[PDB]
Write a protein that binds this ligand. Sequence first.
Ligand SMILES: CCCCCCCCCCCCCCCCCC(=O)OC[C@H](COP(=O)(O)OC[C@H](N)C(=O)O)OC(=O)CCCCCCCCCCCCCCCCC
Ligand SMILES: CCCCCCCCCCCCCCCCCC(=O)OC[C@H](COP(=O)(O)OC[C@H](N)C(=O)O)OC(=O)CCCCCCCCCCCCCCCCC
Ligand SMILES: Nc1ncnc2c1ncn2[C@@H]1O[C@H](COP(=O)(O)OP(=O)(O)OP(=O)(O)O)[C@@H](O)[C@H]1O
Ligand SMILES: Nc1ncnc2c1ncn2[C@@H]1O[C@H](COP(=O)(O)OP(=O)(O)OP(=O)(O)O)[C@@H](O)[C@H]1O
Lengths: 292, 360, 259, 148, 50
Amino acid sequence: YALMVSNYLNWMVRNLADMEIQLGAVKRIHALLKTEAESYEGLLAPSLIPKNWPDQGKIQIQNLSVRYDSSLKPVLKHVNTLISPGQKIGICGRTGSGKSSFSLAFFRMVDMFEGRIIIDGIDIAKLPLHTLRSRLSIILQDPVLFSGTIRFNLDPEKKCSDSTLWEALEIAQLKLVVKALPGGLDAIITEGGENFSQGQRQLFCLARAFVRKTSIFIMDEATASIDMATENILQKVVMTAFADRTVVTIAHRVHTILSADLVMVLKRGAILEFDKPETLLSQKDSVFASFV
Amino acid sequence: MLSRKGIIPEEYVLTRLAEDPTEPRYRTRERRARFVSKKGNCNVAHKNIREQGRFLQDVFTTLVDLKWPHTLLIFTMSFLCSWLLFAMVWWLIAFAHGDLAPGEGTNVPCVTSIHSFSSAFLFSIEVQVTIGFGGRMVTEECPLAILILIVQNIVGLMINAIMLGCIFMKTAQAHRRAETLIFSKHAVITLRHGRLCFMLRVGDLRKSMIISATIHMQVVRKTTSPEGEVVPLHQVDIPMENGVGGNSIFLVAPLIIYHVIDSNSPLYDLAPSDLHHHQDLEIIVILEGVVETTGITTQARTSYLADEILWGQRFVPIVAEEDGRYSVDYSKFGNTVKVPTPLCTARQLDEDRSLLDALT
Amino acid sequence: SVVRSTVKALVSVQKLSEFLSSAEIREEQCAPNFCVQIIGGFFTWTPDGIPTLSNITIRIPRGQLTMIVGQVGCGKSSLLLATLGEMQKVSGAVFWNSNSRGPVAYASQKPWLLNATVEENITFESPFNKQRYKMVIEACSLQPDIDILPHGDQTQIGERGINLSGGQRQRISVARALYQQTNVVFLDDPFSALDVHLSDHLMQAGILELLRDDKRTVVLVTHKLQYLPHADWIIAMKDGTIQREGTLKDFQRSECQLF
Amino acid sequence: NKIMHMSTSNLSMGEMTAGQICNLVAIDTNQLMWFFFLCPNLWTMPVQIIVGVILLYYILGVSALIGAAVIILLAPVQYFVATKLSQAQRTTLEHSNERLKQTNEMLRGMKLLKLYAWESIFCSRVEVTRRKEMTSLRAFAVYTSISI
Amino acid sequence: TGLKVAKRLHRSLLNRIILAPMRFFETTPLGSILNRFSSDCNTIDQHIPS
Ligand SMILES: CCCCCCCCCCCCCCCCCC(=O)OC[C@H](COP(=O)(O)OC[C@H](N)C(=O)O)OC(=O)CCCCCCCCCCCCCCCCC
Ligand SMILES: CCCCCCCCCCCCCCCCCC(=O)OC[C@H](COP(=O)(O)OC[C@H](N)C(=O)O)OC(=O)CCCCCCCCCCCCCCCCC
Ligand SMILES: Nc1ncnc2c1ncn2[C@@H]1O[C@H](COP(=O)(O)OP(=O)(O)OP(=O)(O)O)[C@@H](O)[C@H]1O
Ligand SMILES: Nc1ncnc2c1ncn2[C@@H]1O[C@H](COP(=O)(O)OP(=O)(O)OP(=O)(O)O)[C@@H](O)[C@H]1O
């Protein structure tokens, strides 16, 4: 046994060193497991007290000011502009203030909002967070698509049985993709949108809004896309604002929002201009001067 | 095998980008290295020396540099090694002679009374230390004993003479007198007679005068020449503003030493706003004379970094005129009191003088 | 497991021996006067026959900014690479020389970005001078992009770091080519991927000042409408051959290469 | 050095991608180095076992050889265990790479997910892929338990 | 024990990261999360048991 102690000592130390390093990885894993955040619940009875599905989206903004850390600087400064139910709203505000303020009020994503912010009239705090965003549409700027069946991509959460999904991908935009898809509706996207279009997600968002009864709508700036896409978006907004009665645009191409029912503009911390019509937009040459 | 040894040589995996790791490297705790410490003992470490035995050639000088504990041990080892080696020689020669086995026989011992090695060791002690008890004589029998007696006496005298010389050079050491020379912990820059100068105070504590004192002074800054040279530590000499220019000084009371910052000084462009800790400057002072008792030359070394300087302050007067004689109140040796001074550089003051003096 | 490691080593050596004896860019005696001097230019990409470029007869000394244009896939990138010497040569006399070879600047249609600091990604192992650096980045309009990057010039650009988009990659790639301060410059479609007039012409104006100061060539291979014709020399090609590299008057007489 | 002198023909360079050559430098060279680590073993372990067997017979006799032969005859079974372990590990590791790629794509557009409330679908899909990889890992755990 | 630990830890990690504020994702470098999800998970899966 004294002959075997000579290497038991060595391998005990070696295994101890290896165990130390591997448990450091466990410490880092558990450290990320200690991020006890993102409380998802409802601090109210949500069966009937809040709106089952937002329809008008009357923004009774009660001096809702958002700041993520609430100590560095605010993103909104008492942003109070009432929404325009029954008509589109194209607000080509500066991305500095308007974008952050709108996202926090509509999605409750930036929880630290000084005061209260309510969409659909009832407070957004008194509904489940996942449910609150499950009955609302939104589009983004940077295209983000994964790989999978398109019929399992348009409505994955609800597992809809509607065969109209293919119609949305054949009528709203990218008609030729149906012939380019060997599978059709069940066809699996290739490499997360390899060479389809910049706005394949636009068709998916339209399908979700048409399915999930998403009366309200959110729009974001287009980095680069054919003008026909904005024309189809405008027509979809006319459909969304004549039937669902609400659609909100946010970008910095002013001429996109120029042809709209309403308009707003934000500057350096909060909203700087508000107007129910678009006549004041041309009257206040500040808007189009920033454009061109 | 208890060790974790198995089939995993590939180690092929993709790891995401990692940045800003937690490590104790936010700040550099170590400050600027002092070129010479406040007690002499320069803090410069030689490296990559191509040794050629020069350290070991001068054993005598090496012995002097040794501490007294190690010198005593080497002193002891030298004597003990010689004593014991010749004890073997005396024991072996007697043993070979056959006069070690006792008996009432015809044999007559060459070295009487040698019975064991213990008596041989004691006889070696007697011969080399010249104790000469004489119970263990050297007889006329074997001539080799006479030869070895001559050799042992000569070797003992040589080792005694060498150790005497070393002890005479070690008891004349004055490295423990140079440590009673005192420099103020922090030096000052303050105006005198209208011209700025770098004052300082140096004093002697004991009563034994140091003859022919000599206060040199050097500035140690990295230098980039107009030609582009790179000297990491350039040493520029510094005057002493003495009445005759020479470096000599007579030190009984703690005198004030100051470098008048003339047009040819390397301090000529220093401002108090650039006198922080991480300023690459250092002022060395070298007080070398001959101690009157031992006659051995000594040095005293001190340094003043940037942070050690104290702008615009004057040393407190120390000497007083008491009843019998003068007094030196060493409790005020290093006390500085602020004096009304400009914050301008030396060249800024020169410019101000250049214009103000030329009123007409 | 010892024998297993020996077996794995045998597989690795088989793999390494096959790789080590693959094709080499030193073929056709590649490794042992006008800059763009090509007599016949029977280039190739398959080592033994099957050429994809030939009939190259262009003689161009220095100080000749010559924009290469043509149809899609008509010997544009192939000839740009062949100018450096990476194309297998069968029957063609070429003598590159400059006032032996020089730091031939270049780029491709495909963005290549080092997984390094953005400022490093621009200087590319060259001495860091802020004078030309500021001019080139301003011309490249990468500063507006750096107004959103957290560390800006310090972010880990490219793969193994900060993920970006095609447009930003184009700006960075062309900036790296400009800053190198080389007496020849071989661009490759800086305009096809990103086609904004203002920023492209800003870089063009900055290129005009510096290039012409050193009389350095700039082969702006592209199909941009504005400078499709130029007051400087031009070259056009189709189906792996070039007609004539000179004035635009012959192009008008052809009545086929006009806008 | 042979990267520098290598042509970029689509026939050649279009087949050996950057991933392939990176794997070569990593996998092949590390396992070739490990061969050079264990080269003395194949020159000694033969002598080690031979000398051990010889003087083990001298010490005790024939039953010691029988016990040693049990170890020798169990070597083929343990070689198979190590072989099956490595094979199952590589299958599990390629499966883990697929799952890791899905999670990269998931945690890449998280904003586009949560705003569209696409957290549940991708989370459930990753869990199902984890179940597949876990069955493969269960075979791996079985084989390594046999090894110990 | 090692296999059971890996399974439950992985599902807890997936649940926690999925249900996290999106501002945390945009603020975190996302290389740390990916590292502790890919490389660290591999180490606890195929090394810590043995
Ligand atoms: C270690 C012993 C080495 C010598 C062994 C015997 C050699 C006899 C030399 C006789 C001359 C013939 C050849 C000359 C060799 C010269 C050796 C010599 O000089 O080195 C002695 C050393 C170092 O000196 P160095 O730097 O080399 O000198 C300059 C040199 N010539 C040059 O090249 O520039 O000097 C020193 O650094 C000090 C050395 C003193 C050694 C004393 C040892 C302790 C003795 C105590 C016990 C006494 C024993 C008595 C025994 C008696 C038995 C009967
Ligand atoms: C930072 C240190 C790192 C370690 C290196 C050294 C290791 C030393 C260990 C520390 C504890 C030492 C305690 C020793 C006590 C006995 C010796 C003794 O009294 O001499 C002690 C002192 C010297 O002291 P120092 O501070 O070194 O001297 C100051 C000077 N600056 C210098 O260092 O220089 O001596 C004097 O001031 C001189 C007086 C001489 C008179 C002695 C007469 C008899 C001596 C003994 C002889 C008999 C030995 C018997 C041996 C028998 C063997 C068989
Ligand atoms: N590291 C060193 N340690 C000790 N002495 C050195 C060292 N380097 C140089 N010297 C001494 O400096 C002198 C010459 O130095 P240098 O290295 O410039 O030339 P060298 O090639 O070593 O000269 P030489 O042929 O004279 O020995 C010689 O006296 C040499 O002993
Ligand atoms: N990298 C290559 N290696 C070998 N042959 C090539 C390569 N690229 C193109 N070819 C061949 O040369 C022909 C002409 O290619 P060319 O250089 O004009 O392409 P390009 O400029 O990259 O095209 P595009 O207009 O699509 O950007 C191609 O049709 C093909 O046959």
